[model samples]
Target: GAMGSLEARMKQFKDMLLERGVSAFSTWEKELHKIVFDPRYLLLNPKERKQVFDQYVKTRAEEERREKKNK
Candidate 1:
């Protein structure tokens, strides 16, 4: 099986997120993918981009908080 373009992009995103702690690049890449590639919500406008990016940030923050709480 071949790695699709989106999968490759996601792998790159994961690496950057590991190195950068979910900064703008990671969030933007994730948001772009969710809008342009994901089947569930393929929004193509700036408003949707911001919406998805905000959700990604929220989810990431919650995860960080949970990890800290556990630690």
Candidate 2:
């Protein structure tokens, strides 16, 4: 897949969602509705957004859970 066209917008979407403090996996589904309507969300349809968001959460969730393990 061509990353150029969609890559920038993908990051923008992720950044926009992150603005909503979506670093937690448990906190983003319903919140999707809120951001899905964002002006930037038009870059990718909801399906693509969710696919991309899913990857972000997978990574984000791992980071938090790993850190949450405590020293």
Candidate 3:
């Protein structure tokens, strides 16, 4: 089988999250939608976009971890 495209990979990621019971309208999902739709993001090359996305996810995860630790 051919390697999947970035869009396909993103869709698969979203689907996997959904399978884990994440709501489509959840805060994280809404932030992802914003990133996907932003003009700056759209202007980025595929590699740059992937880097940005990775960084975004990392930051978000760290923030959540901190929040949980504090709670």
Best by lDDT: 2
Model 3 poorest ten-residue lDDT run: 16-25
Give per-residue CA lDDT, model 2, range 1-71, as digits (tens). 67667777788887886786555555565766667677776777878877877887787777867887322
In order, candidate lDDTs are 0.49, 0.71, 0.49
Tens-digit lDDT track of model 1 for 1-71 = 37765555444444444444444334466544544343434322456445445655677667766787323
Per-candidate count of clashing residue pairs (backbone under 3 Å) = 0, 0, 0
Candidate 2: Cα lDDT at 58: 80
lDDT of 3 by residue, 4-60 (tens): 666555555444443442332246456556454534334446675555456545664
Q: 47 in model 2: Cα distance from truth in Å?
A: 3.2
Given candidate 2, what's the lDDT at residue 66?
86
Scored by Cα lDDT, where does model 2 land? 0.71
